Write the structure tokens for this entry.
Amino acid sequence: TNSKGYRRGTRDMFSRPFRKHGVIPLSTYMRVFKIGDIVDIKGHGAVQKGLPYKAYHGKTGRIFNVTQHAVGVIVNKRVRGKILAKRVNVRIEHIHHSKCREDFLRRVKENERLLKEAKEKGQWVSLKRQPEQPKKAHFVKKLEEPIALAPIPYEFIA
Amino acid sequence: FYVPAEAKLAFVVRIRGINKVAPKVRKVLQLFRLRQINNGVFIKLNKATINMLRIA
Amino acid sequence: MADTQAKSTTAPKAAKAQKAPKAVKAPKAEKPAASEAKVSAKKYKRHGRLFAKAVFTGYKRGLRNQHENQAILKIEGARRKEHGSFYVGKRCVYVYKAETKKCVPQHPERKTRVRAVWGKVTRIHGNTGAVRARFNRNLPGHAMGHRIRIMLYPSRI
Amino acid sequence: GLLKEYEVVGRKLPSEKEPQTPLYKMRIFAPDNIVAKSRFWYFLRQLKKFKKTTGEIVSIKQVYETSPVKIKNFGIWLRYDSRSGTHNMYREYRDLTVGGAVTQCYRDMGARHRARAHSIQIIKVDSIPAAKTRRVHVKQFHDSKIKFPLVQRVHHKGNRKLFSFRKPRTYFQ
Amino acid sequence: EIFTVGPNFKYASNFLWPFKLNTPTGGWRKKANHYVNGGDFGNREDQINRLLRKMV
Amino acid sequence: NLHLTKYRIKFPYTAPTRIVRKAWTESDLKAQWKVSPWSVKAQNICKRSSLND
RNA sequence: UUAUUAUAUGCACUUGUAUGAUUAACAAUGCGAAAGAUUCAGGAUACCUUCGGGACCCGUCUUGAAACACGGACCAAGGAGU
RNA sequence: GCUGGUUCCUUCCGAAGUUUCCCUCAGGAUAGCUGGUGCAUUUUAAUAAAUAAUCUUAUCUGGUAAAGCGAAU
RNA sequence: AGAUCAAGGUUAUGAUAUAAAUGUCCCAGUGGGCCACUUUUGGUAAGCAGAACUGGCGCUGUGGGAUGAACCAAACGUAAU
RNA sequence: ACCUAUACAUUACCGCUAAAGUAGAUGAUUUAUAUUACUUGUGAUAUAAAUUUUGAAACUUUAGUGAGUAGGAAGGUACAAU
């Protein structure tokens, strides 16, 4: 009859997944985050002074706090419906980077350079993003082994 | 073996009502401007509209 | 092989004739070498002189509506949908008797005992020859089994 | 449909780690030229890895049975699935063409076994010459010549006059 | 800029209002399922022309 | 779909049409067809067709 | 070279093509007849007469009333948002 | 906080049956939905290089099937 | 981190926008619900209860399984085809 | 091959929502004609004729569009006395 309160429902979430227990790495005690370096909020089991509570874990956010050994985030969570902002304070080793910006920054500097090579011939930019297309119309020699090549099933009886 | 070209330029005509429609197929279908029965528009095909076209 | 069938049955336009577009006969003839022209026989029944008789069978009835602005007919000559399409576009007229006169004979003579609403058939409906039909007013409702008529007007060949 | 015949080859799109994929082929009898295009995937998903869309369907080819005027009979192997007794199966039906020899075979398999079309895979079609048909309801027709006064009609019943006058007296000998 | 597909296409069919196709006489054959078992809606892609000769 | 006549003409059961084209003229059916006394009755599709006015 | 097309038709006129939700020449049928008054369509105005389908008999609380759920015999005047 | 009745016509729009709190559990406040009242403005408002919503592209996110006992428990 | 100069393509995924954008009255109501598919506890169970995610019924006529608030077609200005 | 829905389409029509147009009429406007400046030919003058009104809360025109109790605002009518 309960959630209500403060750490219930942490079966596979809040601990350490397999073969990573014990002493923390020291890479994540080194990282640096400016204002606007978009970052994630996730779970941990090796700094037991601080957590993001039962709903947040698995969400990412902006950073507008720079402090002693903490990070204060903006994050969106579902109320019904007034989806608000929330300011959560947390010690740093709960937190991983976004890599979702980390494709986009090399989407920038290619476009500053591929326009820069375009600045000698003019046409054309072609600088937006497009997924795969309907391709072509080949003609295909066998070339490699003419047809039939006939796999027809018969397998049930066992 | 000469393949034909697999094509762009589809054309999409609604078939079924306004009602008894699935949850997130209500926003996709207002996102092609098919609303009434037997209305149609065209698309520019790629993968990025197939998995909009598949969810209707 | 079927290319002469794009040719040989234009001999009806050569036996009518108009511009004579075929020399091979297709004659339905009594000759042993003349075994063609392919009639979709049989039927042999007239119902076509004038007021060719066709009794009436209720409105274009839904199961649970009416749509009484139209009406549906039973055309006693016809029995397949190639028959009845010759009853496109004819009028449809039905007489039924009543008491008084109340009108002088001026457009061509009428002592006025007969009274008749009017109309016009359109299209073939039933896969055997029942052919629905619209009237001037509405087919007065008690006629389902009255002997209404179809006159030849207008007609062609 | 009348179950026309298509042969069909798949592609497995040409990914650079191994270009020129081996392009396997089926033999599909199908109600339509539009529907074998997504039946070939059902046969192909029994053997290779190959899922749509990681492969293309290079040319379906309608093939035009060669000897229609002759009356050559065929056997078909068969995989029916009834209620739970999915099996192997061998039959034959004596037909004119191969394309008529699969409509009839469906519409016997749906006729005595109920065997819907979602449980039949035409695994093989062989042109049997003679002398190996087991099939007692067929090979009694091998016996040319035959007297055969099985006098039938359409029994068009009867015809036009729904109140006739002339007593329709079938046998007429 | 539609039948040949080009780079002005995206503005070349928001320019059309959706049509008002009538209803295809002969009918719809079943309207039950996807094309490749029963037959109607879906990946039909080539027999759309026998529809639009009727439906429009 | 068909009714039968009464004139059996010999052929091999795997005959091409050309010997049937040969033998049908040899079996003089086209002579004796229109003399069959109730294929005189066949002439109501060959004369009583359309029975002009 | 061979095909091809539009541009090189002003001047008045014409019941005249098409254009402003592109329907209209003809023909018949008839006198708004001093007052009087025939003709053609319409017309359940609210009946009665004749047939085809429809169809539970009205408030209301409730998920649900045709209710084998409560209130209603009929009518005129009075009555509840100040 | 419980039942009965709460009287003229059309046009427009069109819900609730939930969370909390309460000697409340047949009721009320509360947000919720709705309706009204305008008001500020987009080359997304008047003779796009800016937005807000679904898929794509990319990037993180969970232990439920399916498994798994020739690992723990 | 801030203010301020210097260089800068066509603004950077698709498809739309029946128009988007907000402050009051806290505005009348309503705070008892029902069902089918999957997913599913309680119980042997039921046209019972107890729910999460949708669609619908209450608010809704309707054409169709004679019948039936939900079933499946389709969501209802007056008219002919 | 046919079968029927108040659904789908097209023509009318109703109301509703949206968009858009119209006010120097002691003018505007054609139709003719006299003349003319004459610029071949386009314009101004003069005569003759006729069309030209609305609670701009009007009027024209255009597209789309219409279910509904619980409930809120919209103009409309009865029965009053001042």
Q: What stands out?
A: Chain F touches chain C at residues 30-31, 33-34, 43, 45-47, 49-50 (CB under 8 Å).
